[PDB]
């Protein structure tokens, strides 16, 4: 913990959609459209319904005041440069 940065990374910043992107998401989900059992892997839920569950109460779509987080959060600012230099 002593040698950890506090400037996170460019990579570990998760996406968060605004309201317009949520609308685009639900539209792109709705206009979207031998082998047998004991051979399927245990993730066999219906796909395009959990997708809609997550495009309503999901973390990426639950911050109502998110403007553009990935871009303006992956660049580093003045205080972050100061903290980087100091290490």
């Amino acid at each position: 913990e002593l040698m950890r940065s506090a400037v996170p990374a460019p990579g570990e910043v998760p996406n968060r959609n605004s309201r317009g992107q949520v609308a685009e998401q639900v539209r792109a989900i709705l206009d979207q459209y031998k082998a047998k059992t004991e051979d399927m892997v245990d993730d066999a839920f219906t796909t395009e319904v959990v997708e809609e569950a997550m495009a309503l109460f999901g973390d990426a779509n639950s911050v109502k005041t998110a403007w553009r987080t990935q871009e303006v959060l992956r660049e580093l600012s003045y205080t972050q440069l100061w903290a980087l230099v100091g290490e």
């Binding site: 892997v41 993730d43 066999a44 839920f45 796909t47 959990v50 997708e51 997550m54």
Partner: peptide, 13 residues
């Protein structure tokens, strides 16, 4: 592909 995709959904959530 879709098996991997649904596994990723589960792991994320």
């Amino acid at each position: 592909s879709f098996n991997w995709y649904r596994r990723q959904l589960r792991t994320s959530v």
